[PDB]
Amino acid sequence: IFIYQNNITPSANKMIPTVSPAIIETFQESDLVVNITHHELVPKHIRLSDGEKSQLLQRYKLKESQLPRIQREDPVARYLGLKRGQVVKIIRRSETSGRYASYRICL
Amino acid sequence: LYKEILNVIAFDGSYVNYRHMALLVDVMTSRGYLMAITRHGINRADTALMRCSFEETVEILFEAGAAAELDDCRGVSENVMLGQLAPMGTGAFDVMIDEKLL
Amino acid sequence: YSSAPLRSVKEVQFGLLSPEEIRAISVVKIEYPEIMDESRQRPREGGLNDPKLGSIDRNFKCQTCGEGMAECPGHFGHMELAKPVFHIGFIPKIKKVCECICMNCGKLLLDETNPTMAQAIRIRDPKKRFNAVWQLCKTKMVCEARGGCGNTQPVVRKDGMKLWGTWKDAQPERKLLEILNVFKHISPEDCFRLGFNEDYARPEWMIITVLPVPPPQVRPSIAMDTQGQDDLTHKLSDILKANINVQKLEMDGSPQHIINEVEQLLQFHVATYMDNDIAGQPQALQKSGRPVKAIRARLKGKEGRLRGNLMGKRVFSARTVISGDPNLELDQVGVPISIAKTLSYPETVTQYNIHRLTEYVRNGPNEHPGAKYVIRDNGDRIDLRYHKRAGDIVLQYGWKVERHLMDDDPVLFNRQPSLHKMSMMAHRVKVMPYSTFRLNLSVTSPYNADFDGDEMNLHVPQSEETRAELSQLCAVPLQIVSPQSNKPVMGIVQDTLCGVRKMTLRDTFIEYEQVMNMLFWVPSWDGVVPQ
Amino acid sequence: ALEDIMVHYDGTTRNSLGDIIQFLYGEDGLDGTQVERQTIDTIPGSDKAFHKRYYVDLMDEKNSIKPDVIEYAADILGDVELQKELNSEYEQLVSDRKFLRVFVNGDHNWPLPVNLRRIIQNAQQIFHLDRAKASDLTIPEIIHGVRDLCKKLFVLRGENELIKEAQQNATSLFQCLVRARLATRRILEEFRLNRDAFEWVLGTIEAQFQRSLVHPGEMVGVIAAQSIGEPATQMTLNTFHVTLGVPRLKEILNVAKNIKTPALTVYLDRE
Amino acid sequence: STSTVGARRRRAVDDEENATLLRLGPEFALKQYDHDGNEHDLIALSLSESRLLIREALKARSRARNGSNGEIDDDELAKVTSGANGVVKKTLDYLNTFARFKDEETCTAVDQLLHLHPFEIAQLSSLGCEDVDEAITLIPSLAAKKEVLQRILDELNRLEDPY
Amino acid sequence: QKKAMSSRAGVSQVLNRYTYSSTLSHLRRTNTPIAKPRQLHNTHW
Amino acid sequence: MFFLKDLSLILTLHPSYFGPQMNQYLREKLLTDVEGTCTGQFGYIVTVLDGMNIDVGKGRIIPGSGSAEFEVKYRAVVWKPFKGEVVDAIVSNVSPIGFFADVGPLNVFVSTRLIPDNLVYNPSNSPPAYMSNDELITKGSKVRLKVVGTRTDVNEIYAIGSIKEDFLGAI
Amino acid sequence: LAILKEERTTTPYLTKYERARILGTRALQISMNAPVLVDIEGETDPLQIAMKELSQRKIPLVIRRYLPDGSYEDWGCDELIVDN
Amino acid sequence: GGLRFGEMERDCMIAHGAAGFLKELMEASDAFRVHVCGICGLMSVIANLKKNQFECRSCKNKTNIYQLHIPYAAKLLFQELMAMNIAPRLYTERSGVS
Ligand SMILES: [Zn+2]
Ligand SMILES: [Zn+2]
Ligand SMILES: [Zn+2]
């Protein structure tokens, strides 16, 4: 997790996915001054073991694609450091039931 | 997105129930980002006969016979176009005579 | 009745006609460009329309597959073009394909070898694959030698109905004729690499060799008792003629560079026929200025087949002028006798209603509580107003009778613009006099009508369930509480409202004489005058 | 854009692809028709006036149910085991009060299935209750009884947990409204319900609710689609009297990259 | 109509010739599919063995339906439990004037033995045979699937129920 | 006429005859080939 | 050659027959539509095994009218000749162009051109026969033939064949 | 496919659409000279006859409810509680 | 003529979940019996409705044939698409599953 101040070189970062299994992320400084999750509109998200996931799917009879998605370059997706294939349970307040439980897989 | 749409209905005195706006809001949102309710949106998802019944009608078919698309016929539209009962409430199931109980 | 098993479409497969198939299917060699006249004699020359295709004039004739006009869907014929042509709407892809494949050879321009290509090659999406691919191969123009012959690939551009490119000091311009051949060679795993399908639609078929000629029901003729021929039944002939001359220049003193000048014409008329609304203007008007509807014009949304004839069609229906009636239960709808005596309802004969039906039938189509058609098991119909056995007929359980709509028949009443679940509601029928649909006031705002001339459409259910479905979910009473704003959507309007106010004030008093005639008007009245 | 959206036999709102658009229609699985503007008591008012309403203290001369309300008012004063079920309860209501302040506005009026205000008013005269002679409910009768109710207000039905969770989830809000009107204090001091009445109100809340649930089949999309566009045909193209109304909705549905009025509201920091 | 338990999706011309090259229709592959959704070996039915399956069903049939010497004792069980279906009479006479056995055991035996790809195990049973040169000829699919089979061929005429 | 429909239809119509004030009106009519033009300008006084 | 294939059939049923013993009527109608049919696809449907436990499954009610649709899943005994297949039946008829034989529910015909030359068609003989240097064939006589080709027809599958090879002919 | 009479999850109540259509079907069924399982206590209009056939839960019919994935749940008209 | 049941009228019925009635686009308008091919899902079939003869040479069939009920406007939609060279195959059984 490198925290580049103004910007990294195009020659540089072109060396990230070059050391698997391990994985690396890049975060600009001026973009972490305020924790975005902290926002009013931002509801709480949550990761899911390939167990809690392989469950949601059986429990709802879903074909993975039929599940609401979330972007890899999504502000929150990055924050919790998701990956293509991981699921996320969102839990927010609802003026209809009190709390609703939605899920987004990360494409 | 919701808040903004709501404030557009509500700025007119008219009242609509959450569930409605929400559903719309949700449909635009779910595929990952902000899919617009336009020829360049929903009418561009993995939904051929269907999307063909709105805006790009013909080319939508052309590049459909081109890549040889297969249509479920799971869309309300397909069935209307076919003249079959569509999987809509009343048709979202089957009705069979139980000989045993008969 | 058709012995063949009855089924419903559970899947639709799209693709492009392989020339060999069109040939297969065709029942007409279609060589001549005229219609019929065996030298003025009316018939149908073995040349154009019906050289075995469908038919006109109420003549079973149609390759003995009889059926005459109604029952006989059309029958396709074909036409061997003199030289390969571009399918007007695919000209875009046909071009983007070449931009991605090499000529003189015919294979991809980026193999698993190129990394950025692997990726594109893994993108599972018949469309975004062929998308990402082209975004790559449109740059490299050297058939690098794996496969061989690095002949430089030209940069292609669109000029009207022809694809041309330059090979490079200073270029060298040539007009790509040739293409089809290259495509045919394109590898099978390659069709698939691009957005294709080896079975249903191979890249090559985007170019037409043998043209599929659609039959009469498609381009019907309209005689004036005198000629009368459809629009398409012309640009078929315009094409046919542009084909004839071509060939008769390739088997005679063929001035090889004065033929192409005549090939471009056929390419055009065939562009026309299917599409006649393009970039390179030349509207291609029919003698008179008339634009000439291209097949694709018949489809363009709204008015055009898809949105005009399928997502909505004219349909046992009636419409006239509304005026409200303050003495009709909320859910009723007064229908002018005239109309009830016109709209019928197929009620099968049953030992519960035989007695009443045999009466309604004798009554004839001109007495109101009557009927107008009796249909025996033998799929045939008796017209209750002519048949010499009009008043005769004694029914048979199982026969169906078409009776006049009667009081308490559920029917769909509506007023468009139909933007509500409530713009259409099922009402109890009440046959009444005078030429107008008489609806209740409180059921006014749902349709949003007034009586300054406003008209209303009425539809009549036809099955025993159709009706039920209309009364169990669309009945006006079920509609009183609107889901859109979780509150009712019909209240007390005008007079009734205005007055209900007055009548309420402490100052409003009524004496016995009237307090009685008032209690009488309440139908449910317990029959007890309150202290 | 919503044609093919319809509640499914499992209570999922999906389309012609099975793609789940909503796991429980409206985030509760309720049919708008059966819903009315109720007022969640708990939320509004002072901490002082709150307590004086739902608080019951059997271990106290001044904060106990006077034996003129209950039929065991004196034989109940001081019971430690009862004052505990009475805590579970009062401790709950407080969890609510703080959980509802979901609505940072404080506005306690919201659309909620099963109209409890009336449902009780029906008991009111069905058994003719006097604002004088005492009820006949064990404190367990009331408290325990409202818990057994919550158990039958089923929306989703699944056997497993993820489902059973959704159950509790998409319900909650209701339950709070439920407790709010079925706190021992109110149920006895406000609407003197007999033992009989209570068993009726309860039974009805339950029944009513079950009817108020959405029906799988409900062609939901076309519904909300219109429900939204309809109250739009009734607006003016004008943006007079920030870009709003007709053109705005337009602006939005288009997911415009350059709205006429962009503007942006920022609030100071806490202090 | 009446379709089998092999529902393939014929998506938009590949049915080679039928020969004793053991290339039976696609509807009779060595691997057909059971009604319960299981995999099951084809069902070879040499004559006589066929004559039994038939006689047995026509019987437990004329049972719940009431809930040259055999040429007759079979013509009767017919005009009662049969559509009343000439094809069967023929398939029964023929299957009874050529059946090579009589006892459900003598038939069990042949099978407990012979059991090659189903068609063979049957042809060998319903067709008289002496030499291998002969069997390998009237059953041209064998040839290299069993050295000159001769033993077995004998063991048949040895259990070849008398007539 | 010809392959020139690229003209304007409207010029010359079928004179009204429902009422007298109908006919007068019809003759004193103006057209304008196609939110601001439709307005009643001042100059219109 | 005889097989036991696991088929199924669909029958629509008018509401009239919605009595207490319905299972019964479907079953008996099943038989009227299967036992005796013939498709080149499935061959000769001749007999339905294990009647008693026939499978009906619940049937669905067609929307327009009232009938119920049942997918009856059974199992039966069938027989469909293959090319190159070898069997033997009783000679049925016999002309100048050859003779027809009957193997079960079938009739395979042998051409005077698909026999051994030294066997000529007999002129005035009763019943008309064929003479060999030693053999004599007529109606009655049993023949073992080889099915060269097969033609699928109406509700009957006929074929052709020869006895020009070895080990074929009378027995 | 399938789904035991057990582990059945859908509503034990009858959707307005189910009832509407059941009565629908059974109604025309009767008008098709079908056989009735009640006492036409003088009734003659099929939908009425069927409405009765409902209140006495003697309408031999089964609703095969489909799930988005493709599986189903069978329920008899007798079972299905008919609140509405 | 007859009053049109245009799109908007469609919509509503669909909102009502009035499945059958809406299906009844068919009974009150188009409807039509076309004969498809079990193989090349087309409206080719030469159905001489009497002597039963069905066929569809080119695909040379006389055995696997189906009859269907669709709105003639639609039958036309297809004939049209074909003459534009696109092939709307009509299949009576799902093979792709899901
Ligand atoms: Zn024809
Ligand atoms: Zn090359
Ligand atoms: Zn075909």
Tab-separated table of C-alpha atoms and ligand atoms in Angstrom, chain I residues 37 39-40 56 59, ligand 3:
chain	number	residue	atom	x	y	z
I	37	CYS	CA	-39.854	-26.657	-39.316
I	39	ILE	CA	-35.017	-28.143	-37.901
I	40	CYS	CA	-34.519	-24.822	-39.698
I	56	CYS	CA	-40.070	-28.672	-46.411
I	59	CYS	CA	-34.396	-29.279	-45.288
J	3	ZN	ZN	-36.289	-27.273	-42.152
